């Protein structure tokens, strides 16, 4: 049943066939600038367009090196390396590495999964080449940027019941690592997702160099000069859902929010957020994950976070996105620090909205003096100072169960009401809220 091919050129015709079982032979395959052109291997982007359905593709022991210059060979258009348009396909075990750091002419995605019921399993992906690289999103991640960007994201999950499984995604690029747009029932399972960090102090130390940030006097898109004391990811979201997007299934173009996402047993390291699903609709479920050194741990809006952990070294482990947030059920372990604390947010959690049931567990005994569990109040988040992003800060919390099985202090702001707080220690619970209940329990 298995057709084996021994070159990228012989591979490409099968991508237009339904019901094929193909194996690309073990080996190293290189895509460079000379391979893009009208009589060259790749005349169009996406480079690898899986239009067929009901197919399987075996890339075991395949090292695919794509020179980032390919990102500039298709004019001012988005460049996708891999896109799946058909249904019921299985791609497995490919090792795919971006070579060099050349920025896209426009923007790039390594993998776009449209269609329905597809699965990508066992991939090892390394993402490079973007602009600017060094500032995270401080100078713009969308329209109206202070420094114009050429983003390069990793895996874009769209379509229906599409599945990312047992993948390793390393990004050294300014973009999302794994993200979901218009995806219905996407599942990310068993993946290791990793970016890298840089302090805002190191950014501000470009003063006087003529860097792009230096030439705008570090004025961020948030309305104020980049503040010292924060650790930022050079990437965007580790796993981030969007409330918009376009996808294609069965020849139908679809525009809709992501809905019913599921994330299971993922480890997320050094991204802007660990798991953020607050902007998807439907049922959100997160179980068994580990978030290390992200600016933000878990933000799913509503739904279930269970058997999950995050450290607090660079930002809070938990944050309610808006005052609308309702029904956020979470059980989160605050993990031992994976590096030295550098958390300018002055919070381990920011809680608001209503009708939440929240449990925090930890073995940490060394509590940094600036870290507390906040219910309502004015979070000192990098992106929400001085009225920036106003719906994402300074909001009320009501009818919340807070089980603080940790040593972290709790600060109940005056906009909090009907918070039912159980804690290891009550002496470090300040309550300026209304009709809040504080009871002690035995460690």
Residue numbers in the entry: 1 to 443
Copy text from the publication.
FdlA from Flavobacterium sp. SA-0082 is an endo-type fucoidan-degrading enzyme that cleaves the sulfated fuco-glucuronomannan (SFGM) through a lytic mechanism. We show that the FdlA-NTD adopts a right-handed parallel β-helix fold, and possesses a substrate binding site composed of a long groove and a unique alkaline pocket. Our structural, biochemical, and enzymological analyses strongly suggest that FdlA-NTD utilizes catalytic residues different from other β-helix polysaccharide lyases, potentially representing a novel polysaccharide lyase family. Here, we report crystal structures and enzymological characterization of wild type (WT) and eight single mutants of the catalytic N-terminal domain (NTD) of FdlA, revealing its unique substrate binding pocket and identifying the key catalytic residues.
We first measured the enzymatic activity of 12 mutants and found that eight of them (D137A, K141A, H176A, F179A, E236A, R240A, Y242A, and Y242F) almost completely abolished their activities, H279A mutant retained approximately 65% of the activity compared with WT, while mutations of Asn243, Arg272, and Tyr322 to Ala only negligibly affect their activities. However, the Y242F mutant, which also lost its catalytic activity, possesses a potential active site nearly identical to the wild-type form. This result highlighted the importance of the hydroxyl group of the Tyr242 side chain. In our docking models of FdlA-NTD with fuco-oligasaccharide, the hydroxyl group of Tyr242 side chain is located within a hydrogen bond distance with the glycosidic O atom between −1 and +1 subsites, thus allowing Tyr242 to donate a proton to glycosidic O atom and function as a catalytic acid. This suggestion was supported by a previous report showing that a conserved tyrosine residue in β-helix PL31 family members serves as the Brønsted acid. The hydroxyl group of the Tyr242 side chain is directed to the glycosidic oxygen of the scissile bond where it may function as a Brønsted acid to break the glycosidic bond between −1 and +1 subsites, generating a 4,5-unsaturated sugar at the new non-reducing end of the product. While it remains considerably challenging to unambiguously identify residues responsible for proton abstraction and transfer without structures of FdlA-NTD in complex with substrates or products, we were able to infer from our crystal structures and docking models that Tyr242 and Lys141 serve as the potential Brønsted acid and base, respectively.
